[PDB]
Amino acid sequence: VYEATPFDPITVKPSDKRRVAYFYDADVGNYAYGAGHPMKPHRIRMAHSLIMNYGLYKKMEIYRAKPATKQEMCQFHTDEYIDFLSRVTPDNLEMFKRESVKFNVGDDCPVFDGLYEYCSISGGGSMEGAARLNRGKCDVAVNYAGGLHHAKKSEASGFCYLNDIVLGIIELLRYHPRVLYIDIDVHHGDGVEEAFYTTDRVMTCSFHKYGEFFPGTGELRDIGVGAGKNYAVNVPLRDGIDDATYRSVFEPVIKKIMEWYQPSAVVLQCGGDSLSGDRLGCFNLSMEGHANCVNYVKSFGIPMMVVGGGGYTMRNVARTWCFETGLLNNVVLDKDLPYNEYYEYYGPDYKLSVRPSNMFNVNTPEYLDKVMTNIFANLENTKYAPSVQLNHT
Amino acid sequence: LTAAQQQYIKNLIETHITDNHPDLRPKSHPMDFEEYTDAFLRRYKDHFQLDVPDNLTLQGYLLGSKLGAKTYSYKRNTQGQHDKRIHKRDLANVVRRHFDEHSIKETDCIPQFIYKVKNQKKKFKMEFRG
Amino acid sequence: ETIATRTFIHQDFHKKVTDLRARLLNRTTQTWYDINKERRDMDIVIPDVN
Amino acid sequence: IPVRPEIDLDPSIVPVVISLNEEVTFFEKA
Amino acid sequence: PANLFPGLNDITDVLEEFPLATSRYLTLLHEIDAKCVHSMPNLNERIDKFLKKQTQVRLLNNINKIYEELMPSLEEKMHVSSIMLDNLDRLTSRLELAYEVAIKNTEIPRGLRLGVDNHPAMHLHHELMEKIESKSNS
Amino acid sequence: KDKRRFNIESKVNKIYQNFYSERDNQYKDRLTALQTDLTSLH
Amino acid sequence: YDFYIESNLRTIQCLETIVNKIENMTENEKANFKLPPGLGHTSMTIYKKVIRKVYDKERGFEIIDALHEHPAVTAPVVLKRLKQKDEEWRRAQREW
Ligand SMILES: [K+]
Ligand SMILES: [K+]
Ligand SMILES: [Zn+2]
């Protein structure tokens, strides 16, 4: 149930305009995991620079959100976990050797100076975006410091220490029946799916790479337990997938979810380890291919909350985030970067482009046909009973 | 490595590197009223109807410099007006003095405490001065 | 860059002020209805049994 | 004691559900 | 002594009573609504119009007209909601006492509720912490 | 020393009693405070 | 079953209005208070019927009249018992 097509020029439709609320905090870039770690918050700062220098700040409203409190963190995490996060420093680690062993701390998720403050910034931005979306102020709410989707209710997993998306969706659920979550990282969005697995009010939908990969979960037959059965959609894919392939897989899945699940608040993870040239991912996506997802999720017209995620080559996350943010404002930018304080990092021709490679696509019309047919089948037990008057979602 | 700087550095790390128990967070004296959130101070001054101005928070007190003297806050808090706020130390000293001089004798301090504690959840109850 | 962050400073101030006022209005009108209910609850002479 | 077992589908409605000793006792201790 | 299972019996009664109470009030709310279905639509319309606009005086006049036409039915709603809330709080206190006495009795055994001891897993934990404490002793 | 316990219970009961007796003019004060807060926030 | 329980509820309402009128008074406008037959129910007989079925049809006229001539002391007792019979009769409806 899949025919491959060419990839069409990304283009903003004029019948709908948004009120973008952008959340940024000039502190966040100032934290660093360690010497050689692939996770660098500095890239968020870099994206800010382009937003300033392209003249893009002049059609949205830029806010610092107050950091999240300990008891707002314990809405999803345990007390022992959050107390550990709050008390552990790179200097006293020797007095937490049990807890570090017990909470999955030390090599893939080390402790740096400012861990708790960085987590506070992420969670605060996500929850304040959600709250401002509930009050009918904004339509889209952008927070690139959040999207640490691999964190466990009691465990640090995969460069992530606090699941701010869970808190955001918990705040979105106070006023909404049904919330959709889309995850276009190259890894599986496993923290959010484990958190909302046995419910029907959050539908998680991941597009990931399944193999000898990370985290190791998210098969085509993992679809929810309990009353949450058929409310967890996985799309496993193989190396090399490019813009045309990805677009032809991504659009009909999302459109059928919108027609059946009828959600009326979307959260969108826009991770950047799914770009060509990334140092951990293995897809072959362009910048237009990675941004057409955002453009399509926006062409529906329900409250969106866009967040960050992965992206381990700083230049490419910065450029694609700035381009996506320009697209949310109905603006297709220009390709020549303006002079900014990071007018390096953008060799060799200093443009607004992410370039794909020629590596080979290991995904063919039959694997995808089979996957999408299984999904379309799983995805018809998730409607609303005929007598249930809605609010035109 | 000279038998003095050694224990010097040792004391430094033994005093600044701990497990951040909430049981060791430095707590202020109860009689020093400057460590009181500056909303306790305003509520005290407003309840006992003292005669002071409000205080400058901390942002309004570092806002005072030759460069800062051109902001709306300086020129609204330093010209000739009656709302001219002050430094927290002054208001805190006034509050401390009205605290150590006005005095109380029990037989009405305790029963009021009990009626207050047993009605915390109540919206409609005896307001012990309002 | 300094022009942009000037604009950001003023927008953040406006946000915080309007939140302040809406929140104080909501809090007073909350306390009013709680006073009403706790007043009428002192008017019952015979409660319900269950 | 007059327990009155007679035909009943339902149970009898249960009986609906000062004393400042330990408070002033705490104040004594304090 | 014996165990006549009073917690679970009162719980059954409660859970049977819960959905009967609610539906009377839900129908009352539905009845209140049926007056406000030719007032709320055009009110929302005129409000968004006035928000995104010689005639505006007549528009504001119409908006105040509809506002104080529709004011009476908004106190009905919160009166009904308040009595509904009091009823359901009575039911909730009933439920919670029944539940806590079921658990405080053994109408649910405390090996079936809080699980088993030593649970064939959890040898990994004992190994890990044993090594930590051992080379802590070393 | 039960006289102290009797004094304290009498006083607390006195507070409850005074509030219940004046409970009708200790309720227009609340509502004027609230209405002036409302009109002064506006 | 439904008829009896609904009638008991409506009579609870009327008696509650009266009792509230009676609570806030002076101790001598109580002693001389009288309510005429009907009380404000356009179809009044229901309440009497209800009260009969609550007490009996032998010892029920005695009470129906004792609160026709002393509504100040003998209708916080006739109301505290309707509020038992409502609860009990609804639980009986459930059990059957
Ligand atoms: K994903
Ligand atoms: K789910
Ligand atoms: Zn990833």
CATH architecture of chain A: 3-Layer(aba) Sandwich
CATH class of chain A: Alpha Beta
Greatest contact between two chains: B-F, 10 and 11 residues
The total strand number of chain A stands at 8
Globally, the shape of chain A reads globular
Class derived from helix and strand content of chain A: alpha/beta
Q: What order do the SSEs of chain C take from the amino end to the carboxyl end, as H and E? A: H
Helix proportion range of chain A: 25-40%
Task: Give the SSE order of chain A as H and E letters.
Answer: EHEHHHHEHEHEEHEHEHH
Radius of gyration of chain A using CA atoms only: 20 Å
Intertermini distance of chain C: 68 Å
PDB class: dna binding protein
Keywords: deacetylase, Rpd3, DNA binding protein
Entry title: Cryo-EM structure of a SIN3/HDAC complex from budding yeast
Chain A: Histone deacetylase RPD3
How are the SSEs ordered, and which strands pair?
This is part of a larger assembly, with 1 copy of chain A (393 residues), 1 copy of chain B (130 residues), 1 copy of chain C (50 residues), 2 copies of chain D, 1 copy of chain E (138 residues) and 1 copy of chain F (42 residues).
Chain A: E1 21-23, H1 42-53, E2 61-63, H2 70-73, H3 79-87, H4 97-102, H5 115-134, E3 140-143, H6 164-173, E4 179-183, H7 190-195, E5 202-209, E6 232-237, H8 243-260, E7 266-269, H9 287-298, E8 304-307, H10 314-328, H11 365-378
Helix pairs in contact in A: 1-10, 5-6, 8-9, 9-10
Chain C: H1 2-40
Chain E: H1 6-33, H2 40-51, H3 56-70, H4 73-104, H5 123-137
Bound molecules: potassium ion (2 copies) and zinc ion.
Short description:
Chain F: It is found in: Nucleus. This is part of a larger assembly, with one copy of chain A (393 residues), one copy of chain B (130 residues), one copy of chain C (50 residues), two copies of chain D, one copy of chain E (138 residues) and one copy of chain F (42 residues). Chain B is mainly alpha-helical.
Describe, in plain words, how this protein is organized in 3D.
The structure is cut from a larger assembly and holds 1 copy of chain A (about 400 residues), 1 copy of chain B (about 130 residues), 1 copy of chain C (about 50 residues), 2 copies of chain D, 1 copy of chain E (about 140 residues) and 1 copy of chain F (about 40 residues). Chain B has about 130 residues and is mostly helical. Chain B is about 40% helix and about 5% strand. The longest helix of chain B is centred in the last third of the chain and has 14 residues. Chain D is mainly alpha-helical. With about 40 residues, chain F is mostly helical. Classes of the chains: A alpha/beta (about 400), B mainly alpha (about 130), C mainly alpha (about 50), D mainly alpha (about 30), E mainly alpha (about 140), F mainly alpha (about 40). Chains in contact: A-B, A-C, A-E, B-C, B-D, B-F, C-E, C-F, C-G, D-F, D-G, E-G. At the B-F interface, helix 6 of B face helix 1 of F. The site of one potassium ion has 10 residues of chain A, from strand 5. Chain G: Component of the RPD3C(L) complex composed of at least ASH1, CTI6, DEP1, PHO23, RPD3, RXT2, RXT3, SAP30, SDS3, SIN3, UME1 and UME6. Component of the RPD3C(S) complex composed of at least EAF3, RCO1, RPD3, SIN3, and UME1. Interacts with ESS1 and STB1.
